[PDB]
Symmetry: C2
Subunit: 99 residues, 2 copies
Amino acid sequence: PQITLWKRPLVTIKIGGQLKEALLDTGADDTVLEEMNLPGRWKPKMIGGIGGFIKVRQYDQILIEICGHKAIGTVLVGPTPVNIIGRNLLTQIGCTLNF
Amino acid sequence: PQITLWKRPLVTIKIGGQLKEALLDTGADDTVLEEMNLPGRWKPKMIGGIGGFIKVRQYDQILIEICGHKAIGTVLVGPTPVNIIGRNLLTQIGCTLNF
């Protein structure tokens, strides 16, 4: 679909069997979600943005549905206040910015 | 144009007579730029993201060219590490996310 920006670009995602909402975020190199258990194995990672850095857990090859579109990729989990779908997965779903 | 997300979505902007690069950021409610003098008058504001908050100066009705497209709107200036074009101006230029 084509999404407009009058409103925050929040879409439905499905991950680890749970339904969530997440921001389609062209300003995010990475995908970062609120705290959640995910299959087995992680390595430590840090991400920064406005305000500095947070420590997150990196999980690779995780399956996520984004507004119906399946993708498999790296998902970070940590103390973010909003679920964010970054360019890592946005690419896989064929997402472009158009104006 | 249609921009893809393999790479960060950095575009050329022109503001206050200066050429800069800025991120087309669907995850930004607001437009926030590195430190710079701008016509006269501001009011204090704070913005947060990953890592918490920063204090910025809010300037209204500022003219910016974004990749050739003129827009007039609110521009924040403060201690951001990257120039960010948020939904406030992205709307004005007709920017949509498509997948």
